[PDB]
Design a protein around this nucleic acid. Structure first.
Lengths: 147, 125, 53, 66, 257, 186
RNA sequence: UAAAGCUAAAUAUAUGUAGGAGACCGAUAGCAAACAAGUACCGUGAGGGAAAGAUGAAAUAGUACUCAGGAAUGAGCAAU
RNA sequence: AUUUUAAAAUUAUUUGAAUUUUUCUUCUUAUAAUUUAAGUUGUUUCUAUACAGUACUUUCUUAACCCACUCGUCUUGAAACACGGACCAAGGAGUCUAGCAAAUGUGCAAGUGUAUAUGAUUCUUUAAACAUUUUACGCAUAAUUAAUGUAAUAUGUCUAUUGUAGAUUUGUGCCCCACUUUGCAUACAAUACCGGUAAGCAA
RNA sequence: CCUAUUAGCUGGUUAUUUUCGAAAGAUCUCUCAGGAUCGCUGGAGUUGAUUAAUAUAAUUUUACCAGGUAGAGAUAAUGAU
RNA sequence: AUUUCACUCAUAUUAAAUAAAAUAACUCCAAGUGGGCCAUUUUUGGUAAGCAGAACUGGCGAUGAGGGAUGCUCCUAACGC
RNA sequence: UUACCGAUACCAAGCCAUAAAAAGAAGAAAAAAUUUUUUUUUAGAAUCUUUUUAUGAGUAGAAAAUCGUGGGGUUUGUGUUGAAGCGAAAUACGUGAGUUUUCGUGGAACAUCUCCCUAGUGCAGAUCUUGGUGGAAGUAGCAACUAUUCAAAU
RNA sequence: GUCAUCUAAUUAGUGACGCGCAUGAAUGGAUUAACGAGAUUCCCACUGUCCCUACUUGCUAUCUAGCGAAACCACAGCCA
């Protein structure tokens, strides 16, 4: 789309929109992130506050596979399984769904949200938040620890 | 000055010429707006090549019509004459330049029986 | 740099035009590989070319 | 070379070009660092007011919904 | 793309301050016309263009699969209405209906003569004449780049089985075929134009419903793909305006200054 | 010569015509600004104005917020110019009569099963040309991520603007100017 | 299970050769070079390095004859 | 083609009244016309009883009155005794890629993108199109901390934090507004809760 | 040949009309021929107004504030004389 | 202090006047600019300067038109045909 | 003390554009001949149509709408009864970039404005590059080496 | 610088004087016959250097036949 470019509409305007006094020189402020702490310091401090310096210790080789764990919050367990099965677990008070969250692909169960009152539900996960446990037990369910 | 024939008033004649085109051969007369800095014409010094403006625009009721008080329509064969059958008194027909003498006679006779005037009727004969 | 942008990070400070390469032949290679394995399984006379893993 | 050190010329025109903006003057100001032991007590007042009001409304809702 | 180093394959030197000449680089040496001439630079003759074209331009584009399917569905729908097919350029004033479908024996005919006879008997004699007489050598430098002729696009024959239809309807100028399972938007909307005269075999017409969700089959239906929904239930805007419910809502017609 | 602001020409701000070249949306805009012009309904005027808006100003509305907003009046119709998205966090829907520009497939199915129905704006014009018993709703316009970077710059005192960074580890823009231990903080 | 060794495929190919193409350039462009081009020519040398395409369908139609001129040429009632 | 209407004025009749007492006195009662309303209409000649001229339209060239300093550029300031420009033709300069954001359009939406690759009567075009046996990967869906890590009201209730403004809706005084009713977006606050840090306690 | 090295510096930077329209202050800077950042400007968009109001105002009135420049003084202080 | 109930404080000209006051407010992205100069009035250094440095407002720059014979800044007055 | 002259400023009117506004998704009018003919129209495109009011400098800079060029899809065209190009032009249109025509020349291709796609897309300058050509100008100049003459042949 | 001398007249030259801005000993001090296309002053001779220019010769210039460039050039070319 080179015919939509703004330069085309400055075709006979001498300065090409880049100014008559200041001109368009090449790197008049330095290259890349050159002037940080010196003459681009205001830009750096105004838009990237904590840029300079270092904090914390070093993790030499990380291996993110070790600590990878996705989280599902407590208000999505009932939405994990289909609607007619929600209905069928709802009207019947003698059965509860057992959801292996790990199989859907989450490792930890977090506690944000609201479970349905007096609706037991059993959840299997590798990790649980304490509030997630409290809510699951409060609705009459149980948290099963799995690996 | 303004030219007024009938209801058609042409607000200006003698089309604008490019500044300095008179005394430079590389500068064609076709109008270009001069950017300059100290440019005379751009600053609108009196007595030097006034620039076109929107204020010269002809009125839209009589904008595109020819001195015969109708709009021109350029045709390339007899097939493009059909729409003129309805507005034969609002449109005149001009035959395109690259139409042969084969087809020019046909277009002329068809426009004649269609009762629509032809601008360049006596071309190529 | 100017305005509120992410700090630039482009790792193009070396001679990168030498190393640029574009895969104009992705589907051509796909067809060639499919033809080669089809010819292999046609040549080995009905024995599947896959091996059990 | 020598530089024009300073001038306030045209600054008033620049300021008035977009007018002298006035502060928005909102109705509520944050009480983050003002009069503790007073705004804490105000928090307690408001909590009690909501407790009583909500319990009255809940009583009305229960007695109207049976 | 141009040759990589084109225009820059000379010795660089711009001895030009005090020489009363422009500071552009000049080729060295003597005894030849080129000596002392302006070297590489977009303004110089033989100097290489301003931004040499490179093969790593973004030639292709990635199009969302859902958008492509939406476009194909819309092209089929547009081919299904008479006004759009007429406005596209086809001469279908003698067709009985725009979504015309023919018996599956069209997939079996194997002579271009009988293909043209069938096309004429459907009433597309004008279309065939347009396609035949439209063959014309094009203008410009294209015709020296193996692009001599320029034909218009005629009917698109959509078939389910190939028993000779492919080798019977080709060689007719402007006519192209398409298997219903692999129908292509580049053929359905040539040039981005809306509504293409499409001739369906009965089996292909029926298999459209299988392909697009109704009567699902395992290896034919586009899996878990939902036909796009319109944002309006009925586009008869002026009919709903003339409905008496809204006519009662409109208040008295006012007048200009 | 005369002393007038903007040389005497009234200046308006915002959209004047729809940018979308969607034929159905163009028909909808024609119908609804005809309705706005002819009827007195501010309801119709607002709908015509909102049909014109950019995508970022007709944000999606979840079924949860739809139900919550329509909680008190159950017999009226929720009219939202954006799209309606399904909320998995919601356990149960109830009998919703909603007109919207677009419906998600899941949201649509949930509404039909709950027993309500999904309405388009042409149907809304047909049945409720003035807007009786129609509650005009819109989703969160300032909730999108791009707005989290706006406002005071990140680095101004008490600024909540989210910066533009490659990633958010400890070693990415977290040292000097973001904690008292390194020079200042914010 | 180091301080010995071999090993096909998937991989790369601004080279050479041979094919096929192109939303490429169209003789100041495109390779330096559409042609007798890395040629002519320049430099002691390492090296530097061009310009230059188009009658007409057919020259198996390339201008016969006459006049004037030493000739080049010109002119014609002569000629393709 | 449903305001060049209505009226206003005037004229000619007509009704009653008033009053400066009447040949332009005023106010209505009716009728019918006019324009001073409700932006120029009429008459007569000529063009001319021609088919392109000595006329009319137009281009050009010359005069004449008035006016008019070389452009481009740097510059506070250029006609400058500031620089470039003898002339003409052709060529001649914000592009391409990577990566980010904003804006807008489009599709789908708590998901989105099918990557590499595979299949398939597709193999001029086709190096594109078509497809993907019911946890690949990116981004998003949760944040915070150097970090071991921890991780969002809370089961009294499929209710969904609280205010002040506020769009829309509902009724009472189908076209005003004041009371009710509902309370989107958003703004300004207040609350809870999550991570970190303090302080208190600490099996 | 690396190499079309780099240049905060000089020169150039190609169609028309229409609309809006500046700054030559300021802060920091091995900064003073530069830059970043405010300010001034355009475009986009929303919320509003469209109700001869309210918001609003390089304006005044009314009410109330703060000042130590012009003037005045040397006999009121200091300094002179 | 907050909350809830009451009663009611001009609005029919609008809790003083005036107001082509919503041409507002806000948000986003971004250009150019960051050598200035002149006039009136005030003022510092200087013998003084078309000198150097400041304050207010208006201009020149960025701007032509009529006048001042002539003139970037004066007077009138700013510009569609 | 009068009168007069005197602006691109002021006032009235027309027209262009910009901005805003009021409003809008179907039926016969006239004229000329002689009851009948004839001639014009008889409209309805929402970034549209009709009408109203105000306003219009502008460097650097920004935006919109337009005007052109090479090439690509789509459509529908022009060419030996002469295409492209070129020279001069035009009662031509536009405000303007331009567009369109005529004559001449030319002798083989050309356009698409129906919509869109694409870019090596627009020159007065850069002591710009290459090529060609000027005034200077029939001018500067054809100056070291002492020196030539008569007759004849070709 | 002062004193002598040189002249008519001496910012010159030479000989002396020396509290020497800032002389001085192989950074070599002082002096030196011979030598020098080295710098400087004076005298004799000489003469167109000059008073004060004139005449004259060759080769150009100049006119003609022939041949025939270039630098420079925004546009150009009267003044207060």
């Amino acid at each position: 789309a080179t015919r939509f470019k703004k330069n085309r509409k400055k075709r006979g305007h001498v300065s090409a929109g880049h100014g008559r006094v200041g001109k368009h020189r090449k790197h008049p402020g330095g290259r890349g992130k050159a002037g940080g702490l010196h003459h681009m310091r205001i830009n750096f401090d105004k838009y990237h506050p904590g840029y300079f310096g270092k904090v914390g210790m070093r993790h030499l080789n990380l291996l993110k596979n070790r600590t990878y764990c996705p989280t599902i919050n407590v208000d999505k367990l009932w939405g994990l399984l289909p609607e007619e099965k929600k209905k069928e677990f709802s009207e019947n008070k003698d059965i509860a769904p057992v959801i292996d969250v790990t199989r859907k692909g989450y490792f930890k169960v977090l506690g944000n949200g609201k479970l349905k009152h007096n609706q037991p539900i059993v959840v299997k996960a590798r990790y649980f938040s304490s509030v997630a446990e409290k809510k699951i037990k409060a609705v009459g369910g149980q948290c099963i620890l799995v690996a | 000055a303004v030219k007024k024939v009938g209801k058609i008033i042409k607000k200006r004649t003698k089309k604008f010429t490019r500044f300095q085109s008179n005394r430079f051969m590389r500068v064609k007369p076709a109008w270009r707006k001069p950017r300059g800095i100290d440019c005379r014409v751009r600053r609108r010094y009196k007595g030097t090549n006034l620039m076109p403006s929107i204020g010269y625009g002809s009125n839209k009721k009589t904008k595109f019509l020819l001195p015969n008080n109708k709009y021109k329509y350029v045709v390339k064969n007899v097939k493009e004459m059909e729409p003129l059958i309805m507005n034969h008194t609002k449109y005149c027909v001009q035959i395109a330049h690259n139409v042969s003498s084969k087809k020019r006679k046909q277009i002329i006779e068809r426009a004649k029986q269609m009762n629509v005037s032809v601008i360049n009727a006596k071309a190529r004969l | 740099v100017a305005h509120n942008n992410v700090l630039p990070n482009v790792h193009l400070h070396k001679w990168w035009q030498r190393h640029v390469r574009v895969n104009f032949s992705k589907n051509i290679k796909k067809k060639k590989r499919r033809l080669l394995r089809e010819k292999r399984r046609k040549a080995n006379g009905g024995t599947p070319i896959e091996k059990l893993h | 070379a020598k530089s024009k050190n300073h001038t306030n010329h045209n600054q008033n025109r620049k300021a008035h070009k977009n007018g002298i903006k006035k502060p928005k003057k909102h109705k509520f100001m944050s009480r983050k660092g003002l009069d503790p032991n007073f705004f804490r007590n105000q928090k307690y007042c408001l909590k009690g007011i909501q407790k009583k009001k909500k319990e009255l409304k809940l009583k009305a809702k229960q007695e109207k919904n049976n | 793309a141009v040759k990589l180093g084109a225009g820059y394959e000379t010795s660089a030197e711009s001895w030009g301050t005090g020489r009363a000449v422009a500071r552009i680089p000049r080729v060295p040496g003597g005894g030849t016309h080129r000596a002392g001439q302006g070297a590489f630079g977009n303004m110089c003759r033989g100097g290489g263009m301003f931004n040499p074209t490179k093969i790593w331009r973004r030639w292709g584009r990635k199009v969302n699969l859902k958008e492509k399917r939406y476009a194909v569905c819309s092209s089929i729908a547009a081919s299904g209405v008479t006004s759009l097919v007429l406005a596209r350029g086809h001469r279908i004033s003698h067709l009985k209906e725009v979504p015309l479908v023919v018996s599956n024996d069209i997939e079996s005919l194997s002579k271009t003569k009988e293909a043209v006879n069938f096309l004429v008997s459907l009433g597309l004699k004008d279309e065939v004449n347009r396609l035949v007489k439209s063959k014309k050598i094009r203008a410009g430098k294209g015709k020296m780049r193996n692009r001599k002729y320029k034909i218009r696009n005629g009917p698109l024959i959509i078939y389910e089985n190939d028993n000779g239809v492919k080798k019977a309807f080709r060689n007719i100028p402007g006519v192209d075929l398409c298997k219903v399972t692999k129908l292509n938007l580049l053929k359905l909307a040539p040039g981005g134009s809306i509504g293409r005269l499409c001739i369906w075999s009965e089996s292909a017409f029926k298999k459209l419903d299988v392909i697009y969700g109704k009567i699902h089959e395992k290896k034919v239906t586009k899996k878990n793909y939902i036909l796009p929904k319109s944002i309006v239930h009925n586009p008869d805007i002026y009919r709903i305006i003339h409905s008496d419910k809204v006519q009662a809502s409109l208040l008295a017609k006012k007048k200009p200054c | 010569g005369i002393a007038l602001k903007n040389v005497g020409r009234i200046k308006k701000h915002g959209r004047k015509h729809l940018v979308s070249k969607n034929p159905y949306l163009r028909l909808l805009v024609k119908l609804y600004n005809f309705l706005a012009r002819r009827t007195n309904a501010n309801f119709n005027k607002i709908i015509a104005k909102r049909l014109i808006m950019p995508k970022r100003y007709r944000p999606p509305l979840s079924l949860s917020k739809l139900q919550y907003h329509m909680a008190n009046h159950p017999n009226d119709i929720a009219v939202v110019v954006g799209s309606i998205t399904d909320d998995k966090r919601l356990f149960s829907l109830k009998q919703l009569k909603v007109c919207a520009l677009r419906f998600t497939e899941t949201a649509r199915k949930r509404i039909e099963d709950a027993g309500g129905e999904c309405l388009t704006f042409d149907q809304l014009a047909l049945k409720y040309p003035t807007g009786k018993k129609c509650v005009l709703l819109r989703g969160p316009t300032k909730a999108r991520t791009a707005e989290k970077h706006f406002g005071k710059a990140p680095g101004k005192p008490k600024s909540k603007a989210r910066p533009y960074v490659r990633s958010k580890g400890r070693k990415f823009e977290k040292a000097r100017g973001r904690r008292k231990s390194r020079a200042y903080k914010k």
